Design a protein around this ligand. Structure first.
Ligand code: HEM
Length: 407
């Protein structure tokens, strides 16, 4: 039929679920760029999407994303045993103690940045999160980061996802940010291999610099650089989820008090933040063989997009997805396909986000400080979510006035 690209960019989070609702189905055939695209939504859809005998990621990623968001040669573009062996490198980083260490470093950096925020009077909370995250994740990952460069590197990491997918000249800064960050990370890898950088044996940058592939070869310095940015960048992106934590504390009644007094509530709350709020709209794969599913044809080579936001707001799964209610997670069966803000399926055997433990730990630190430590006022502003923005944010970016902290 018609090309629907422009309609998708106008409503990137909701386009799929809205059409699904219109059609009374969990899937529909469409066309993005010029490719026929099957669009899927829901737990059953997610589960077939993560079947690696039917779906491949190889070459499925639009080049614009490679040259900004993702880089070229990274784990996202791999399939099969090549993929599994590369994904294992990421998974080995995420021990409960290593995740804890990153959370601890991030709390310290948050606390160090508050005085700065106090003397400012008024801050855009979102704008202020990138640098502490950058400082935290760099130290955790063994990436040296001098004090006077921290601001700039945070700006560059931010530019990879917050200027990327944009209708404006911001796409140009994003592409240059990618070349700068790639060259920086590459210099890090090279110094580790040459002995000039003493990154500890438990650190991401070390693991990535010394990773051997299935042929016992080091990654090429550029591919290693891209994989290191795949740790640094998405950690800084947690700024979005932290902003949504502040937003929930502000727009939904009872949340604050429940968090203060109920110990087990934090975990339910951060889960519901990830379910409720838009972040990553969709993931893309290519059908690897001819098959049919619930009446829909999936010929070899068909581009297929899995709607994450729609799946997270699926009525069959949640009954009242439209409500923000952390308690729903008391009844969650931990299914790997019905709740997928960072992908579904298995972490080792598919492309599901290895960053979930980090996101959760950091979201918890955020929720803890925002209720138990950090005091602030919230002036009249537009807190409505910008569903036409990538990534989606409250329009204001969540503005704070009179910020101060204890311990
Ligand atoms: C900030 C919130 C985050 C969101 C919303 C998010 C979401 C996602 C999604 C939707 C995917 C694709 C899953 C798929 O292709 O099936 C993914 C993959 C990935 N994520 Fe995240 N993530 C986040 C944080 C992180 C963090 C902190 C890390 C740190 C290591 C990380 C590292 C990665 C990597 C390396 C991949 C590719 C994995 C693969 O292809 O096997 N992410 N993420």
């Amino acid at each position: 039929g018609p090309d629907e690209t422009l309609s998708l960019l106008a409503d990137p989070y909701r386009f799929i679920s809205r059409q699904c609702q219109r059609l009374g189905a969990n899937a529909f055939e469409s066309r993005f760029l010029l490719k026929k695209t099957n669009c899927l939504k829901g737990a059953k859809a997610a589960e077939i999407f993560y079947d690696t005998t039917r779906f491949e990621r190889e070459g499925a990623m639009p080049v614009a994303i490679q040259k900004t968001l993702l880089g070229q040669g990274g784990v996202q573009g791999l399939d099969g045993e090549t993929h599994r062996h590369r994904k294992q490198m990421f998974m080995g980083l995420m021990t409960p103690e290593r995740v804890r260490a990153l959370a601890q470093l991030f709390e310290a950096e948050w606390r160090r940045a508050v005085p700065g925020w106090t003397r400012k009077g008024e801050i855009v909370f979102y704008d202020e999160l990138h640098e502490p995250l950058t400082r935290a994740v760099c130290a955790w990952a063994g990436v040296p980061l001098p004090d006077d460069e921290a601001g700039n590197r945070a700006g560059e990491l931010r530019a990879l996802f917050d200027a990327a997918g944009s209708a404006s000249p911001r796409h140009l800064w994003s592409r240059l940010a990618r070349r700068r960050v790639d060259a920086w990370a590459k210099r890090i890898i090279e110094g580790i291999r040459a002995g000039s950088i003493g990154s500890g044996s438990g650190t991401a940058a070390y693991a990535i610099a010394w990773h051997r592939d299935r042929h016992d070869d080091l990654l090429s310095p550029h591919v290693a650089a891209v994989e290191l940015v795949n740790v640094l960048r998405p950690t800084v992106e947690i700024a979005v989820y932290i902003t949504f934590v502040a937003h929930a504390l502000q727009t939904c009644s009872g949340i604050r008090a429940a968090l203060v007094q109920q110990p087990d509530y934090a975990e339910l709350f951060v889960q519901e933040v990830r379910r409720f709020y838009p972040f990553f709209p969709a993931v893309v794969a290519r059908a690897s063989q001819d098959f049919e599913w619930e009446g829909m044809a999936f010929p070899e080579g068909r581009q297929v997009v899995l709607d994450l936001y729609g799946s997270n707001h699926d009525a069959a799964t949640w009954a009242d997805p439209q409500e923000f209610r952390p308690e729903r997670f008391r009844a969650w069966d931990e299914d790997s396909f019905n709740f997928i803000p960072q992908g579904g399926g298995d972490h080792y055997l598919g492309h599901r986000c290895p960053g979930e433990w980090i996101v959760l730990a950091i979201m918890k630190v955020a929720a803890h400080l925002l209720v138990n430590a950090m005091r602030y006022d919230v002036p009249d502003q537009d807190l409505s979510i910008d569903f036409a923005r990538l990534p989606a944010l409250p329009k204001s970016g969540f503005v704070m006035r009179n910020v101060h902290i204890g311990g």
